[PDB]
């Protein structure tokens, strides 16, 4: 009888690595979509187009505008909520959206507790390692009415990790 520690990915950014555990047991579709886009190089070259100190940093848009991106299936998909998955700590990873069931590819990472998002945005991950990298991202000189970082900071490429207990 073996154990499966599940899948996780490491975001290789211009300012460091961020390792994210992906809750594939709870949010299956969100999990497969994230892993698939990650493997297709979809996020390679993506910048964090909106960084709000104390709130969250958002990315996942190839176009870099703020209204781009889509799912591996090429069509927005349903939300996946769980009463045990909440924006209660610094480092939760969730899917941005424009209302119920409009999940595509954009996602964000919280800089702290953000209870008003619970049950409104699908949380599918958590930063397990590389918290340092999050601090660098937060204290980044940004615009002021757009929060667009002054200097572009990208996600160079992504490493997918398999079951740690294989």
């Amino acid at each position: 009888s073996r154990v499966d520690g599940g899948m996780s990915v490491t975001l290789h950014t211009d300012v460091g690595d961020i390792k994210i555990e992906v809750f594939c047991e709870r949010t299956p579709k969100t999990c497969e979509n994230f892993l698939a886009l990650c493997a297709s190089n979809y996020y390679n070259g993506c910048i964090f187009h909106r960084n709000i100190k104390g709130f969250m940093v958002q990315t996942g848009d190839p176009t870099g505008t703020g209204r781009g991106g889509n799912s591996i299936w090429g069509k927005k998909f349903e939300d996946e909520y769980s009463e045990y998955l909440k924006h209660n700590v610094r480092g939760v990873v969730s899917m941005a959206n424009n209302g119920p069931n409009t999940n595509g590819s954009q996602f964000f990472i919280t800089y702290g507790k953000q209870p008003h998002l619970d049950m409104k945005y699908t949380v599918f991950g958590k930063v397990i390692d590389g918290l340092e990298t999050l601090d660098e991202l937060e204290k980044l000189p940004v615009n002021e009415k757009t929060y667009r970082p002054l200097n572009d900071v990208h996600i160079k490429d992504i490493t997918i990790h398999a079951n740690p207990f294989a």
Binding site: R50, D61, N97, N98, G104, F108, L117, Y121
Partner: peptide, 11 residues
């Protein structure tokens, strides 16, 4: 306010 949308950014 503090929302995470994709396109129409609101307050």
């Amino acid at each position: 306010x503090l929302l995470v949308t994709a396109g129409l950014v609101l307050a």
